[PDB]
Swiss-Prot record:
Pathway linked to the protein: Siderophore biosynthesis; pyoverdin biosynthesis
Protein name according to UniProt: L-ornithine N(5)-monooxygenase
Annotated GO biological process: intracellular iron ion homeostasis; pyoverdine biosynthetic process
Activity-pH behavior: Optimum pH is 8.0-8.5.
Catalyses which reaction(s): L-ornithine + NADPH + O2 = N(5)-hydroxy-L-ornithine + NADP(+) + H2O
Amino acid sequence: VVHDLIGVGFGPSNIALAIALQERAQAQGALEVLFLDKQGDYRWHGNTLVSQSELQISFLKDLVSLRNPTSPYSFVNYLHKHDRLVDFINLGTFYPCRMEFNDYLRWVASHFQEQSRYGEEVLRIEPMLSAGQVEALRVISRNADGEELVRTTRALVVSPGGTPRIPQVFRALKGDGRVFHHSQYLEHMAKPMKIAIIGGGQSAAEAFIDLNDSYPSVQADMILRASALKPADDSPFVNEVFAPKFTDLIYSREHAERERLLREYHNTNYSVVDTDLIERIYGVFYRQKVSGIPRHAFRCMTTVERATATAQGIELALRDAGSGELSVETYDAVILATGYERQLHRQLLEPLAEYLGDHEIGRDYRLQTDERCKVAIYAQGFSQASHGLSDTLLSVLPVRAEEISGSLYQHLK
Ligand SMILES: Cc1cc2nc3c(=O)[nH]c(=O)nc-3n(C[C@H](O)[C@H](O)[C@H](O)COP(=O)(O)OP(=O)(O)OC[C@H]3O[C@@H](n4cnc5c(N)ncnc54)[C@H](O)[C@@H]3O)c2cc1C
Ligand SMILES: NC(=O)C1=CN([C@@H]2O[C@H](COP(=O)(O)OP(=O)(O)OC[C@H]3O[C@@H](n4cnc5c(N)ncnc54)[C@H](OP(=O)(O)O)[C@@H]3O)[C@@H](O)[C@H]2O)C=CC1
Ligand SMILES: NCCC[C@H](N)C(=O)O
C-alpha cells in the first residue's frame, strides 16, 4: 500500500495543508495521506507555553481564513464551538494567549485523526527506484516504543519546524542538564538560583519575564551582545511584507534584492521583542533602581567567550564591550534563547541528495529534481530566502496550502 502523500510533522504548516486537501477532495477526489509527528501528545511548542505568551500574529491569520473564511476551522468557528466567542470578544484583543492557540490547533487536528500519526519521528526518506527513476519514497520513522516504521508514498512534504541554534561556545555542553535551549524550557525548569539567558529576542524576553514572575527564588541575567532590545515592528505599511501578494514579488526579485529586502525587514521578526514586553522588562529593571535590590542583571553588550561546566555551576567569561573588560560569572543554570535554524537538507533527506537540484525551491514549494525523480517533494518553512519572511510564520499558511495541494493534485493527476 502506497500513499499519495506523507508529511513530516503535523504542526501548523501541515495541518493547514490537510484542510486544503480536504477542501479539494470533493471536486477532485481524496488522496490517501498521512502526517507523522514526533509528539505523542501534540502541543504547539509546548515547552514554551508560559503564562503571558501572546500570539504574535493576528488571530485572523489563522489556519484557513485568508483562503476561506467560511471554513469550519477558522479560529472564530473554533471559539463558537467552544461557546467562547462572545467572551473572546469582550476581550478586545487580536492576540490570543498562545495556550489558546494551541487548543485551537489541537482541535482542528482532531478532525484529521485518520490522517495523523503521532508519536512517530521521521528518520530518513529513501528513494524507491524502478529503472533508475525514483517512483516512490520510503519513509522511515521510529515510534515512541522504539519500533521503526516504513511506509511508502507517492509524494512527500516536509514541514518539521526548525532546529535550535546553539552558539559554538556552548556546543561543548551538549547533554548537561544545567544548560538547555529555550525550546525545551518547561521540561528543564521542572528540574535559590542564578540562571542566565543568552539572546535578545522574544524567546529571550519571554524567558526572563517568566522567570521573574514565576520563580522568585531565581535571579536572572540577560546577556545581550546587542546593546538593547529592539521592538518587533508590526506597522501596517511594513506588515505588508507578510502579505500573500508579497510572496510573488519577492520571488521574482534577483537574489541581491531578496536579501536586501530580508535585511531591511529582519526586524519584523528576528532579534526583536514585542513592544509591550520591552516596557515590562524595562519596568522591572527600573524597579530595581527604586528598590535598590538588584536581583536581575541586564548585561547588554556582553559576549560569552568561554563556557565550562563545574561542580559549582557553569562558568562563563563575559566580555563587555565598551568596557572592554572580561569578567567571570558562574550560574546555576543557563538558558539559550538563541533561536532556530531552518536548514533544509539534514540527515533526513540525504538519500535524495543525488536527485535534488541546484535551483531553489519552486514557487509552488516543490523542490526541483532530476528527470529521474518522478515523485514530488515539497517543503514548508525552508524557503525564507526565496519566499519571504512569511515563510517561517503563520502568515500565509492558508494560501500556501492551497498552492501546494494544487500542485500535488496536479502532480498526482
Ligand atoms: C515559541 C515560538 C512561538 C512562535 N509564535 C509564533 C506566532 O505567535 N505567530 C507566528 O506567525 N509564528 C510564530 N512562530 C513561528 C512558527 O514557526 C510558526 O508559527 C509555526 O510553528 C510554523 O509551523 P510548522 O508546522 O511549519 O512548524 P512547527 O510548528 O514547528 O511544526 C513541526 C512539528 O513537527 C515535529 N517534527 C520536527 N521534526 C520532525 C520529524 N523528524 N519527524 C516528525 N515530526 C517532526 C515538531 O515536534 C513539531 O511538532 C513561533 C515559533 C516559536 C518557536
Ligand atoms: N508567539 C510568541 O509569543 C513567541 C514568538 N517567538 C517567535 O519565534 C521565532 C524565533 O524566536 P527567538 O529565538 O526569540 O528569535 P531569534 O531567533 O530571532 O533571536 C535569537 C537571539 O539570540 C541571539 N543569538 C544567536 N546566536 C548567538 C550567539 N552565537 N551568541 C550570542 N547571542 C546569539 C540573537 O542576538 P543577535 O540579534 O545579536 O544576533 C538574538 O537576540 C520568532 O519568529 C519569534 O517571533 C518566540 C517566542 C514566543
Ligand atoms: N513574528 C510574527 C510576525 C507576524 C506578522 N507581523 C504578521 O502580521 O503576519
